[PDB]
Amino acid sequence: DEINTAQDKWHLLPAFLKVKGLVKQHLDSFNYFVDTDLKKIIKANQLILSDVDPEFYLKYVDIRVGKKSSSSTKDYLTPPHECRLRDMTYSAPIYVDIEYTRGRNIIMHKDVEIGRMPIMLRSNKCILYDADESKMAKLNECPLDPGGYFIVNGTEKVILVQEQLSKNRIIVEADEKKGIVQASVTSSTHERKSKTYVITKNGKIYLKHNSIAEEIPIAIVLKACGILSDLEIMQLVCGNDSSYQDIFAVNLEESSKLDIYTQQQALEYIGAKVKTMRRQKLTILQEGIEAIATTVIAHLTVEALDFREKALYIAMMTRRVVMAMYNPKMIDDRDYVGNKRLELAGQLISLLFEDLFKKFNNDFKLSIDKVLKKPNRAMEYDALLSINVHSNNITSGLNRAISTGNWSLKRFKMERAGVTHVLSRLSYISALGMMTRISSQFEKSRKVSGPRALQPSQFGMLCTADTPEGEACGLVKNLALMTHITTDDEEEPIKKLCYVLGVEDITLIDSASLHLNYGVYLNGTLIGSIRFPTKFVTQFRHLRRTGKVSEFISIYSNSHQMAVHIATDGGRICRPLIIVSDGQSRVKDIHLRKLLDGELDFDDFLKLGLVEYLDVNEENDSYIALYEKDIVPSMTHLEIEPFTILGAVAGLIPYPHHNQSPRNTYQCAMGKQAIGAIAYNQFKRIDTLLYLMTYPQQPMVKTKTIELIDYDKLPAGQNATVAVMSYSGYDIEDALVLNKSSIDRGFGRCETRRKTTTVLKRYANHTQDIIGGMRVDENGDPIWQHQSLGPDGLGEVGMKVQSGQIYINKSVPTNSADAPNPNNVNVQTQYREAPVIYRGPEPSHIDQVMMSVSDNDQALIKVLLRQNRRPELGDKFSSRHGQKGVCGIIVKQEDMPFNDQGIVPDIIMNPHGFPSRMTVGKMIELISGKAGVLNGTLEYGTCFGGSKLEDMSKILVDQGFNYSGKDMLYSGITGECLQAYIFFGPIYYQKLKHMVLDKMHARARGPRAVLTRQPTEGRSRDGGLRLGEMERDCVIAYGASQLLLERLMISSDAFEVDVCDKCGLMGYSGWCTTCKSAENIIKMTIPYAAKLLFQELLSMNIAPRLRLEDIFQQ
Amino acid sequence: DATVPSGRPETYIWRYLPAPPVCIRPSVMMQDSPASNEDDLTVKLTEI
Amino acid sequence: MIVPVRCFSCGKVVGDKWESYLNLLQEDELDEGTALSRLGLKRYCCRRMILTHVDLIEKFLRYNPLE
Amino acid sequence: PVCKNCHGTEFERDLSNANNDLVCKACGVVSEDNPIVSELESREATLNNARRKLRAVSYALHIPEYITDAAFQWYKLALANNFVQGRRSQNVIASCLYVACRKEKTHHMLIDFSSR
Amino acid sequence: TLKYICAECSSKLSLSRTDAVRCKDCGHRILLKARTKRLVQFEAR
Ligand SMILES: [Zn+2]
Ligand SMILES: [Zn+2]
């Protein structure tokens, strides 16, 4: 084992995943909220007071979640696998510590219960933190479950990682028809939601805002901030020796039109036309209302006295509005990935909790003074009694906002809905990729396919091959394998550190020199106006690589303008890459060997300075190398591992680079629907609907991805023996034919299980529900419905059910809404039945039945059914490389061909897909499989590499077969050889969802709607399908005039109406009721949907006066 | 046009209003409770 | 779960060999490819049945209801 | 409920072929085809406040709501029987709680009410 | 009989009806039914 840094750089990627797994985006954000962010909320809501009894105060000192301070034990907690079986919330209580004025003396009390907040599993606060497969075996939980999701009141949901544009920054924009605008939103953390627009009306620059009644030309608002000399402005906006002075020259003369000319007169021009907010005092000075008008705007910076920096921040904003008017090439998209701030849940539920807590400590405050407006109830009164009534608003506000994924915010007044989603346990990887997925904001640019497409600045940031299709085509995307999000730390020390590094100050520099030099932009704000950044920025990296400053900083530095950029806002995308200094890297394979000893982890490399995190903005400036054989003496930041651009749901495809790129996007949506095994406790859990596979098989041509997620420890699907050939004509377009023997051997026998539940309900008249059953008839208890109903009324475990055959009896009192009579007169027989009947066209079994109680004392019943089935023809299969397949026919083993050894192929597929679909991956997998089969050794098919071909054919020919594996075989139906050679071997085939046994539906004549009397839409609603308008026009294109009448009212909507002749409207059964003689009545028929039509227009003043003729006597 | 009974322009603003049958506005029972979820057609007419 | 009694492809019985194939690995540390050739399995359609069977009955039995 | 030929009183809804027709077993004539599926104020105000007060200490004493709902009708009859007038409003409803606490046979005592 | 058994206590309890929902020998509140004695017919395919 001669180790080297040429091909063993892969081995440090598991050292990343071991100490730092895949649920960074959910665990660490939730943990940092619980560890740190709980204190930073309560400190800004402290010291509740009352106006009545002014010497009373309550203040809380600190808050804690979980354990007390007296016991100081870990906890005693319900198990979550137990908690999901009782439809309860898996939550943890919050303890607060308070002091207040009881009376004569003030008193401090500890550990006060205010609510129970939910906790996601595998956090450090839950009991599943760092188990050893025995405590978790005692808690019967699968250790291969990643976790990261709530178990509120039964169902398991998860917060999706939302995003928006980069807040608190400006963007450039161009539009031809309506002028060009400059959007700049700012959202400070206290109620502020402000966005500013810099518009261009016919060559004149303005600023409109939704707190100002009109627009203002900028020549006023620069003098209002102090900068008035009017030669400073063009020196700041335009510079010297350009055409910018010519374009900007329109805006100068308007200060002469308004005749202001000074700093003092510049203010009150705004406050004249300001949209004045009602402060209920209205002190307004006509000097300070304009001073605050230069404070509540552009909320990045607020100035105490000078307004100097805020002025130049406007000058930076209005500089690029003319550069965009100079040429439309300088504008940018809002689709570039650097203009996006992805944001996690733990700092997002911080917004949700602070809304509830400010709603908590004022409703309780409304209770206090209502007691304190009493003479007697002001001395001995204690307020700790009134806590628990108001405490319920938190927990119900928690669980409702997580079950119903809609959030009613108040300080921002915004209704982001659909934020929570029930996770799918269809496959093992189906729950993996939902943890790593991105949901956009759909900013109503539905016409433009720009954001629908994929940006080239995504290589290694997040995954590019997993993106759905259909209604969600490009607005949902998925995480890559090596990815970290940043977090903010502070801007205070770095602005002190750059002064030490030799940058100037904004309040000292001449305005001519800033356009000559560059400028340090701290989150878009100029403070120093740096010169010669190449000395400046490289001395900063040596502070970061050695680790004097934090590593989540980006030193993006453009050259289209004269500027450099600093970003520490946090919540932006990045990935780590190893530093390359010069024509030699910093590989140091002896340290890579010292990793595999086990003391030198991934963390110490960035501690020493062998690796650092890079965002997309640092990837502007950097020059990442492909390989160690590609090093230039001008070449930095070697790419650590090339196949890390695909996630674990994109990683399991063997040899993706040989396959076509749309054939990789098809499988990731369908790999989530492949059935198999789910968890270790899957026979213990009781969930709504489960597909299970009897015999899975770990695939032959493996990948480095699947062994990093242990996908082979629980596979889904199995390997066939594929003979790609035309046979019997039943496979023409991607169909499949398999052998009748191997299904009897047990190839592909799945299992279907389905939960159903009932709740025994308690009524206000103290009447329960009873499970009496097995009414008897002719010496035997069981009716044809009652053979499987058990002695207790609960259906007996151990036997099948068929259609009909009540399996849960239930009887309900008939006085379900009557008032309780305070006596005992007549309650002996009131139970009418509401039994539960097994539907379905196929006989199934129960799996097992449980009973329990809810969080409140109310009885719970949960039974789960069980049936297996064999995949007969019609069932949908796939190929892991994007080849769907429906079973064409199921023929005998004697009908299938056979080799010299008699090996019968499991399935056959037509050859007519591989040239069209351009899928090379199956063609190599069979070669990589069969030679690996005969060698017994499982092989690695990875991206950008994997097992090669020329070494694999040498093993395949030493066994004595074809070097290309395209063998010859005999015939099954006539015996002799076949004139061609047959490409034969084993290929891993998964079974999908969407089987035919639960998709056969047909309705002949059944239920109808109430308002339309139409057949009811819905397969569970007993169907009747919509023959729509696009199909309606094709019938007239045939010219058929009677089944058009028949299939539109006779088969659907026939209804007989008697109508009056003169003043002709309908009447009822035999009457006219508009000329009440009931004589001139015509029996005919119309659509019922036409009958309601001229009844609803009659509701308003419209008279459909009907006129008749006879059919005959032309 | 003349010669018709409703040919006055006086009947082109609401003085009377007819009530439609309850088949058009069905009292649907959602079975979330023993109370019926009564539709918006009746309660707008009730405020009238 | 457990090994299927027969081969899915040909149909020869493999239920007496799972313990035997495991026996030739703990004691007598051997190449896995030549292990079942000594055991008598020549056909490569049956080599997939034992190489790639994940035996997950061992992880399932630990969640027994009987402590 | 009554057939037109046999006048039977037993009707059986057949769901074997998803038609959901109604038919008797005696002669076999259908009953119905094409099923049509269903797709004072001062007295009011003094219970609206009393509803708030029942909900208050039930949140304090962790009372599950099938008692608080059941206890309102115990308050409703004594509202009609002139038990409320003169007596203190806070005192009468807490006595009304313990009735349903006793009928439901709970662990809840009586001094837990009076201590609050 | 072979009546109701606990989840992890695994204790046969013929608990009389409308009385309790918990188990003996443990505070656990989720209940398991034991399998019947009656024979059931199956095929072998
Ligand atoms: Zn008429
Ligand atoms: Zn075989």
Ligand SMILES: [Zn+2]
């Ligand atoms: Zn009849």
Ligand SMILES: [Zn+2]
């Ligand atoms: Zn027990």
